[PDB]
Amino acid sequence: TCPFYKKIPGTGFTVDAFQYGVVEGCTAYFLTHFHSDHYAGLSKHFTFPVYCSEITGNLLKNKLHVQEQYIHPLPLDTECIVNGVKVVLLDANHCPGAVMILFYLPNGTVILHTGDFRADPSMERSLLADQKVHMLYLDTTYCSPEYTFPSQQEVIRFAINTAFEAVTLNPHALVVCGTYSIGKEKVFLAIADVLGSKVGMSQEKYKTLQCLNIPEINSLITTDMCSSLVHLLPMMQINFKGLQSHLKKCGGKYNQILAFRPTGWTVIPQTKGNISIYGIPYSEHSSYLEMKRFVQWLKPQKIIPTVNVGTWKSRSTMEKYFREWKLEAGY
Ligand SMILES: O=c1c2sccc2n(C[C@@H]2COc3ccccc3O2)c(=O)n1O
Ligand SMILES: O=c1c2sccc2n(C[C@H]2COc3ccccc3O2)c(=O)n1O
Ligand code: NI
Numbered sequence: 612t613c614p615f616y617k618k619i620p621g622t623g624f625t626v627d628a629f630q631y632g633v634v635e636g637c638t639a640y641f642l643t644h645f646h647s648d649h650y651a652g653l654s655k656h657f658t659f660p661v662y663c664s665e666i667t668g669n670l671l672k673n674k675l676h677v678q679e680q681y682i683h684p685l686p687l688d689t690e691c692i693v694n695g696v697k698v699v700l701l702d703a704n705h706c707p708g709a710v711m712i713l714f715y716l717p718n719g720t721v722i723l724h725t726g727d728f729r730a731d732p733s734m735e736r737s738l739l740a741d742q743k744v745h746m747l748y749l750d751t752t753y754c755s756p757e758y759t760f761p762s763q764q765e766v767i768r769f770a771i772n773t774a775f776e777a778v779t780l781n782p783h784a785l786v787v788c789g790t791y792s793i794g795k796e797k798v799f800l801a802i803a804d805v806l807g808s809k810v811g812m813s814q815e816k817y818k819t820l821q822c823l824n825i826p827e828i829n830s831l832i833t834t835d836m837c838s839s840l841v842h843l844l845p846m847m848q849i850n851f852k853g854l855q856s857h858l859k860k861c862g863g864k865y866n867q868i869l870a871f872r873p874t875g876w877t878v879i880p881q882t883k884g885n886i887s888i889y890g891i892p893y894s895e896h897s898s899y900l901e902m903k904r905f906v907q908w909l910k911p912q913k914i915i916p917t918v919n920v921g922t923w924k925s926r927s928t929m930e931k932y933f934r935e936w937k938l939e940a941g942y
């Protein structure tokens with residue numbers, strides 16, 4: 612059955628609820644972003660209205676083959692009405708097309724659903740700053756104080772320097788970036804840019820990137836694997852066995868592979884010869900401190916976690932931090 616934290620009280624709206632069949636009473640199915648854990652169950656056979664960002668709409672149409680008639684894209688930072696309810700979509704600082712949703716209920720209740728997000732101080736200078744938020748449906752992925760990771764700017768700097776130094780030393784080295792979900796494009800795009808290269812990838816991945824409305828995307832990506840010094844591979848192929856196999860397929864060129872595995876929370880590489888694999892802490896979710904700062908700024912009356920809610924221990928642990936944040940901030 613559809614869980615309580617995927618339903619919007621006082622409306623017939625659900626959020627990221629496509630793996631429970633037809634949810635009783637639901638008139639509009641919202642999709643925060645095009646990540647599999649969240650669109651799970653959506654297919655070409657889905658027959659109900661889906662509300663989402665323009666970018667997510669492109670991906671629904673072109674990758675999932677959802678009929679255009681059920682896809683209702685909405686602009687960002689724009690007040691819109693859906694089934695009689697005022698809503699606003701805000702950038703979630705997650706992956707391309709990912710949004711947070713502000714629901715303005717008729718009774719004056721304001722609900723913010725963060726989808727997946729990486730909290731940032733720029734959100735404290737947005738449409739959120741105006742009205743009060745009574746319920747917060749919160750991406751609690753890393754709601755534990757051990758979850759610290761650097762800024763995205765810091766991780767990109769390490770990746771760029773690592774890649775530039777390795778290829779300037781060895782002009783015949785190959786850089787590979789593991790990708791699965793959309794998101795974290797800055798990793799391979801920044802590496803390619805500093806190497807004066809395009810990023811080669813499979814046709815299915817090129818098609819995915821073409822849906823993302825990235826400025827000047829045809830100037831940085833290509834399907835011609837041979838021509839590029841940066842290759843995208845499925846993340847499950849980012850291993851010594853796969854990188855050796857991929858090493859041979861490049862017409863015997865490239866005598867070295869430098870690979871990046873962009874993992875959120877776990878730097879030296881695992882090296883088996885001419886192959887090195889860097890796990891880099893590029894996250895598109897809030898760290899604990901970023902999450903805590905956002906919530907203490909927003910001062911919501913009620914928090915509904917949407918992540919790690921499946922065990923009583925995790926729910927109890929998150930409620931403790933919520934109380935600590937509320938006591939410390941005085942709301
Ligand atoms: O919906 C998901 C799902 S479903 C299964 C995995 C995920 N992840 C990746 C997880 C997030 O939490 C993590 C904590 C520690 C290490 C890796 C992690 O990776 C996610 O980041 N999101 O958003
Ligand atoms: O934000 C994310 C991220 S970040 C990295 C992966 C994801 N996923 C995909 C899910 C399902 O597939 C996965 C496979 C491997 C690791 C995590 C996964 O999580 C997601 O569904 N969301 O929403
Ligand atoms: Ni996600």
Ligand SMILES: [Zn+2]
Pocket residue numbers: 646648649727
């Ligand atoms: Zn997720």
